[PDB]
Scaffold this active site. Structure first.
Site, mmCIF file in Angstrom:
data_model
loop_
_atom_site.group_PDB
_atom_site.id
_atom_site.type_symbol
_atom_site.label_atom_id
_atom_site.label_comp_id
_atom_site.label_asym_id
_atom_site.label_seq_id
_atom_site.Cartn_x
_atom_site.Cartn_y
_atom_site.Cartn_z
ATOM 1 N N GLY A 1 -50.516 27.419 -73.649
ATOM 2 C CA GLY A 1 -50.981 26.454 -72.129
ATOM 3 C C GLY A 1 -50.571 25.549 -71.990
ATOM 4 O O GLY A 1 -50.157 24.927 -72.470
ATOM 5 N N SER A 2 -50.397 25.576 -70.406
ATOM 6 C CA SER A 2 -49.830 24.485 -69.803
ATOM 7 C C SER A 2 -51.171 23.935 -68.949
ATOM 8 O O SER A 2 -51.217 25.206 -67.896
ATOM 9 C CB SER A 2 -48.718 24.255 -69.810
ATOM 10 O OG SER A 2 -48.365 23.498 -69.092
ATOM 11 N N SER B 1 -52.608 20.417 -65.946
ATOM 12 C CA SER B 1 -52.366 19.269 -65.445
ATOM 13 C C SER B 1 -51.672 18.493 -65.893
ATOM 14 O O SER B 1 -51.232 17.316 -65.815
ATOM 15 C CB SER B 1 -53.177 18.896 -64.417
ATOM 16 O OG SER B 1 -53.309 20.323 -63.745
ATOM 17 N N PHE B 2 -52.996 17.601 -66.901
ATOM 18 C CA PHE B 2 -52.866 16.647 -67.842
ATOM 19 C C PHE B 2 -52.777 16.817 -69.233
ATOM 20 O O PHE B 2 -51.883 17.055 -70.022
ATOM 21 C CB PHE B 2 -53.918 16.038 -68.097
ATOM 22 N N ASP C 1 -69.331 22.432 -70.161
ATOM 23 C CA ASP C 1 -68.273 23.092 -69.607
ATOM 24 C C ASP C 1 -68.200 24.691 -71.040
ATOM 25 O O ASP C 1 -66.676 25.537 -70.800
ATOM 26 C CB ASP C 1 -66.685 22.849 -69.763
ATOM 27 C CG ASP C 1 -65.736 23.349 -68.522
ATOM 28 O OD1 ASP C 1 -66.484 23.385 -67.554
ATOM 29 O OD2 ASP C 1 -64.311 24.057 -69.340
#
Ligand SMILES: Cn1c(Nc2ccc(C(F)(F)F)cc2)nc2cc(Oc3ccnc(-c4ncc(C(F)(F)F)[nH]4)c3)ccc21
Length: 257
Positions: free
Chosen positions: A16-17, A19-20, A128
């Site tokens: 998984g990739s 933003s940070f 979340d």
């Protein structure tokens, strides 16, 4: 202590990739997952959030919570957890459209509730909870995690979606996200499917003009469950039950099947 001495973790396939963050399948006393930071030199804010995540994770020791295994500072800031076999609840329900039997659906609810109650007992607010963060390990054990890498407005309680206070996040806010998770389990769908405008979903949920259509629940869904779903999804947060009481209701309806 939980610091893994540098030159031990073998980072492999990038799974998984974001933003940070970037999650990799790895090797550290068997298959492990590694949440990493891209940068060579981290922000003092980045170093704080890493310290905070490891801080939360070292407080957890439960079957329904993803197993924290250790952290590493050099070369890159990394959090090592168990590697899970399978797919997220989101993947099961919405991508590959897995047809779970009612008994399993209720068990997935019971397991999520179990894990939620543990975090709340440890005064931890997930902030979340969503089907993408519920991992159905070895196809039978719920593992609550943070598989996200960035908002996700479908699980947000009206008071959160409104942002009418500094911290609208509560144990109750999590109960509403759980309510939406129950809607997914019992309808096999995401809420507000017929609305193609995010800003309008935001506007309306906040203003309480729009709520999930509970008539969409599977025919075999127990009346008790549909009632529980309705309580978890109350617009007024004080009217929402807490996880010890949620668990009680789920475990009870489970017995009558
Ligand atoms: C650090 N960190 C967290 N933080 C966390 C913080 C608080 C809490 C709580 F306390 F609030 F509960 C829970 C978790 N969550 C993570 C999730 C990570 O992804 C994983 C882990 C294991 N397996 C996989 C996998 N197996 C198959 C596949 C696929 F998708 F490729 F098939 N992916 C993927 C990696 C690192 C994670």
């Amino acid at each position: 202590d939980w610091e893994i001495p540098d030159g031990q973790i073998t980072v492999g396939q990038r799974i998984g990739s974001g933003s940070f963050g970037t999650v990799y399948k790895g090797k550290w006393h068997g298959d492990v997952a590694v949440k990493m930071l891209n940068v060579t030199a981290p922000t003092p804010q980045q170093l704080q959030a890493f310290k905070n995540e490891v801080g939360v994770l070292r407080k957890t020791r439960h079957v329904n919570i993803l197993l924290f295994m250790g952290y590493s500072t050099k070369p890159q800031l990394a959090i090592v957890t168990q590697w899970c076999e399978g797919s997220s609840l989101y993947h099961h329900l919405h991508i590959i459209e897995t047809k779970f039997e009612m008994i399993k659906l209720i068990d997935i609810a019971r397991q999520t509730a179990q894990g939620m109650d543990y975090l709340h007992a440890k005064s931890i607010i997930h902030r979340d909870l969503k089907s993408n963060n519920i991992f159905l390990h070895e196809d039978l054990t719920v593992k609550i995690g943070d598989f996200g890498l960035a908002g996700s407005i479908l699980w947000m309680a009206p008071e959160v979606i409104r942002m009418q206070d500094k911290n609208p996040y509560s144990f109750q806010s999590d109960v509403y996200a759980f309510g939406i998770v129950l809607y997914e389990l019992m309808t096999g769908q995401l809420p507000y499917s017929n609305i193609n405008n995010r800003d309008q979903i935001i506007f309306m949920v906040g203003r309480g003009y729009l709520s999930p259509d509970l008539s969409k629940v599977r025919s075999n869904c127990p009346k008790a469950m549909k009632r529980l779903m309705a309580e978890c999804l109350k617009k007024k947060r004080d009217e929402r039950p807490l996880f010890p009481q949620i668990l009680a209701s789920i475990e009870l309806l489970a017995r009558s099947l």
